[PDB]
Amino acid sequence: FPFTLSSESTLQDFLNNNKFFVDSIKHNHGNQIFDLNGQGQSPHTLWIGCSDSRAGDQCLATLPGEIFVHRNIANIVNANDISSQGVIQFAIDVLKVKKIIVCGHTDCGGIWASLSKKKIGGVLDLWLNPVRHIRAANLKLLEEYNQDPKLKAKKLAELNVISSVTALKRHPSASVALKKNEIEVWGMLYDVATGYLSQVEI
Amino acid sequence: NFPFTLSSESTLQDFLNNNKFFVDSIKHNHGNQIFDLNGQGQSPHTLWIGCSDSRAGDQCLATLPGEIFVHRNIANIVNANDISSQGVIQFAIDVLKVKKIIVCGHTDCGGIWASLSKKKIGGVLDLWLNPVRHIRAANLKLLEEYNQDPKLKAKKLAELNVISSVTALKRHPSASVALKKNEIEVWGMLYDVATGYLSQVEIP
Amino acid sequence: NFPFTLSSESTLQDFLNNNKFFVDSIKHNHGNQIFDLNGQGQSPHTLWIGCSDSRAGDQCLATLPGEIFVHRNIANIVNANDISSQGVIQFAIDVLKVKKIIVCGHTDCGGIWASLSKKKIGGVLDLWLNPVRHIRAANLKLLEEYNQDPKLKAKKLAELNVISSVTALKRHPSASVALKKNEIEVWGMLYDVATGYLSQVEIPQDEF
Amino acid sequence: NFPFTLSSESTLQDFLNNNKFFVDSIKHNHGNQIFDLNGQGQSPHTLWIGCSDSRAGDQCLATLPGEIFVHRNIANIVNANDISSQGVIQFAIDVLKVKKIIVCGHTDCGGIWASLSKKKIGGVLDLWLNPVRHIRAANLKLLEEYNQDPKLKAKKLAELNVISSVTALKRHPSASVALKKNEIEVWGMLYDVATGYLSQVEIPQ
Ligand SMILES: [Zn+2]
Ligand SMILES: [Zn+2]
Ligand SMILES: [Zn+2]
Ligand SMILES: [Zn+2]
């Protein structure tokens, strides 16, 4: 379409996009940024967000070596998910990030599925359980946005962000550094139709 | 406090200023066309599995929002016991019907280097990395026809790890059916953190 | 050696000798009927989830082969991202169509004791047991009401753990459906290691 | 009703009653001695890893409580990335110091039959069973030599699966150190569901 790449696009087409990424960085910064990249990483921020192609840490327009990223379906931080827990562990314990952003977004597939109770199948029903819990736990509140789907899904999306932030703060290395005031934590919402990022109230 | 767009000392406002740029930048080049398409759904053409590392993101493909479905974790490990990986893989193929999948490791991977050391890492990480530890053991001293240079051992390990993840990805139910119907293609790649260059890994 | 049927020093043939007795015993009491049924397929009426502990097995229910579908792991933890447990539950409900599910903890459970401590174990077990450490953390005050007797404290955590596993089990997509259709029944239980007796664990009423 | 002790329509009291029998039966033969030992701790000599199947089951060894540490899961898969199994093995070897580990497959195993097809099962089971589908693929020419009797096809696969599980078990760090110290024995077995009999599987060495 109006996108840089397509289904039909070739391997070389991909490598052309990548040669552009290098040329652009080099054009604005010389070799200095890859020289830094190539010695170590010292990112300032951990971003935890949905896997969704339209959400994504891109929205912050940072350079390589600024943001440590974890992305998964519906930006769920669960204590038993070893994928999340390693990333958080490593981010706080090794990289010493000073900010953590948990970012959800509008039109989230996990959020919408969790509202309409038809079993998705495979492993997805299990993966989404905590969201299905969050909806059940907040039924009255959600009910008050009943008269508009997109807003109910959005309220749920926000509740999910808050849920993930609490779980994040209860992480052992997080909880320590948080109370030593070494770290800062934010919930956010990404608006898919506008590209704007707003802060969730916590 | 950097040649980077943000530092540790930045503000919520500063952050939000970067995002205002992102939006203005997209609008400058494309008008509302993207955020209009985005706002009515996603139809990405590619799934990207790579490392969480702040240098080796999918950014290195310079795509716009709406093109690439992403998962990132420590050392780009794909395992069938991991409901996170498999959930993503499943959704991408069956629902989103992505036509390309990319597994990307990269040079200077902390997970890979740790997998090469003696020192127990601690917590959940040492367990997380066991799959890589197994790959080192499963590959001779093919790893160190190179113990003359640390960096090359790391790179070969990283590539073996990519190959590991790719094979696993291919044995996924959705993947094996898609690949047999020739309805999807699969790539393993390495990002050189020092150069910004992506390259292909040959998959056996 | 010595009250027990087999020992460390036992032999393969000794084990096979026990198995010979198991076969002869069932044929003595039921003739050939059971092994003929077994041989034609399984139709168990119950799923049992309990701890691996050698003292606490489903044999405490004195059933014959073909009755009880069994999963056993350390501290009878049922967690929604553990593919082992969730496969067992999906299969039992969907395919076997069990009518009863029992989640059964027990007293002197080592997973419980380990979780009451703060000392790290090692290997996988500190992470396996993490759900239990959480339950203990979320009931800290309730539990410290049993500082008078550590044994009763551990017994309480064993119960909370049962309650946690059951609740997770019921949130399984196959289970939640079967339940709301009243096609299945779910029991928390506790097994007293010292008496061989099985008690029912009171499970919270439906709250969401 | 059945020829089995309990039914789909059996009650809670009814279950408690079979448990009451269990207790009575054991004190009848052994006094309070088993439960006294039990009550103080556990010292099992054997770890059993086997299938969840209601017909299989470590009861085929006719042991008293306190002898055998048990793990059971679908098709008795011992996989290095499966933490349920890996915890059981660690604890058994490192803490309980079991002297024997037994991996037991069985005939008519539903996980085996499902791995013989490549029809998708759905939910989680395609993933769970993947390492067995692998085994099928890597032994295809062999398993097809059993085409005319599907049941002996499933038996061979169930034996291959046992060999694979035992191989993974022995690569467990606890196991490996124990194995090299001649501190433990590991056995593959198969359980014939139709006959109640247990046989040994020849494992490579
Ligand atoms: Zn989403
Ligand atoms: Zn890395
Ligand atoms: Zn126990
Ligand atoms: Zn079976």
Author numbering:
A (entry chain D): 27 to 228
B (entry chain C): 26 to 229
C (entry chain A): 26 to 233
D (entry chain B): 26 to 230
Give verbatim excerpts from the published study on this entry.
The pathogenic yeast Candida albicans can proliferate in environments with different carbon dioxide concentrations thanks to the carbonic anhydrase CaNce103p, which accelerates spontaneous conversion of carbon dioxide to bicarbonate and vice versa. CaNce103p falls into the β-carbonic anhydrase class, along with its ortholog ScNce103p from Saccharomyces cerevisiae. Carbonic anhydrases (CAs) catalyze the interconversion of carbon dioxide and bicarbonate. β-CAs are active as homodimers or higher oligomers formed by these homodimers, with one zinc atom per monomeric subunit.
In the present work, the crystal structure of N-terminally truncated CA from the pathogenic yeast Candida albicans (Δ29_CaNce103p) was determined at 2.2 Å resolution. To obtain crystals, truncation of the 29 N-terminal amino acids was necessary. Δ29_CaNce103p forms a homotetramer organized as a dimer of dimers. CaNce103 is a complex of four identical subunits organized as a dimer of dimers, in which the dimerization and tetramerization surfaces are mutually perpendicular. The subunits in each dimer are interlocked by their N-terminal arms, consisting of two perpendicular helices stretched from the rest of the molecule over the neighboring subunit. The active site of Δ29_CaNce103p is formed by the catalytic Zn2+ coordinated by Sγ atom of Cys 106, Nε2 atom of His 160 and Sγ atom of Cys 163 located 2.3 Å from the acceptor atom. However, in the present structure, a molecule of β-mercaptoethanol originating from the crystallization buffer fills the fourth position. The contributing residues, most of which are hydrophobic (monomer providing zinc ion ligands: Ile 129, Gly 165; neighboring monomer: Phe 146, Leu 151), create a narrow tunnel, which serves as the only point of entry to the positively charged active site. The substrate tunnels have similar shapes and orientations, although the middle part of the Δ29_CaNce103p substrate tunnel is rather narrow compared to those of other fungal CAs. At the overall structural level, however, Δ29_CaNce103p is more closely related to CAS1, which also forms a tetramer. However, the conformation of this segment remains unclear because the first 54 amino acids of CaNce103p were not visible in the crystal structure.
